[PDB]
Amino acid sequence: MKIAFIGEAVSGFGGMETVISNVIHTFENSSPKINCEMFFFCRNDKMDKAWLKEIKYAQSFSNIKLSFLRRAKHVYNFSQWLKETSPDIVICIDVISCLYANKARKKSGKHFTIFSWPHFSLDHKKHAECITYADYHLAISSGIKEQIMARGISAQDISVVYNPVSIKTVIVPPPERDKPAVFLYVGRLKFEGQKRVKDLFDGLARTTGEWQLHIIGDGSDFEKCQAYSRELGIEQRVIWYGWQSAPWQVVQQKIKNVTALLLTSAFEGFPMTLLEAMSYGIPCISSDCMSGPRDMIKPGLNGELYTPGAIDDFVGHLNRVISGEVKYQHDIIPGTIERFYDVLYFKNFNNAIFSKL
Structure with missing residues (x-):
């Protein structure tokens, strides 16, 4: 005391x-x-x-x-x-x-x-x-x-x-070979501003290879984000879940296999969802924003970081995880955040x- x-x-x-x-x-x-x-x-x-x-x-x-x-x-x-x-x-x-x-x-x-x-x-x-x-x-x-x-x-x-973050006893596996890549976004929806969902869609629209995006969250910009996905022609690859009380239950029960969680923010107070994803063995691709992501992500091991604004670099990280050029081993990712x-x-x-x- x-x-x-x-x-x-x-x-x-x-x-x-x-x-x-x-x-x-x-x-x-x-x-x-x-x-x-x-x-x-x-x-x-x-x-x-x-x-x-x-x-x-x-x-x-x-x-x-x-x-x-x-x-x-x-x-x-x-x-x-x-x-x-x-x-x-x-x-x-x-x-x-x-x-x-x-x-x-x-x-x-x-x-x-x-x-x-x-x-x-x-x-x-x-x-x-x-x-x-x-x-x-x-x-x-x-x-x-x-x-x-x-x-x-x-x-x-x-x-x-x-x-x-809590230690988990299950691992979320990648999609089986020859299935589309499965990307995950968990958070409040803001088109620009702090979250820059616009960058998420811009990057995914430029990628090579078959992919699907699952979005858990909402916000006032929900309609604006939906129209932007339609403008980019990616709307049939995006699945919207709205607000969810237990996102990680939705992940396990409904999505089941995840290639990577994506975070495209301009800044973060603390990106707890990234820690949560890695505790389930999901690799994370994040902007290297103030602050947090660079303390959790180890490039090449549990995900990647890109310089703020470098959408070309983000797209490269997406292409490589889709193709298998870079492979993150979901079974060892929870061990990479030991100190958390x-x-x-x-x-x-x-x-x-x-x-x-």
């Missing part, structure tokens, strides 16, 4: 919430308990509490409209909480909370260590400069580590902890904290 996990209020149904609750519980059962608590800075109470089931938390509100005054109230409320708790460790799940923690530490008179643990590219969310208010840093990607070092932080004060699996992840996460202490 004792570790405080603090951050601005979240929706309550995110991937981030899943990792946080999971990390707290296995901290809570590590030693006799090593105690964990959470503190949220909120504008309202719209956050769902389901995920905080067995989690002790407190909140600070504040909906004053001048942000200077709202931050002042948050720093005060968290300063008082620090006096009633006494945590040894404060871990901030967003960058603005690093500022709140630092200012409330001086105000409260308490002594503790502040870790940042952001869950999105600093360059793509506000308040990036607030990262410098933490003592040490827990980076879920090498890209995040580079962004922190760019603000003057020493690499020795940043540990890359990645993010966790729950138990080893938590081991290095725990060590990244107590080694700085």
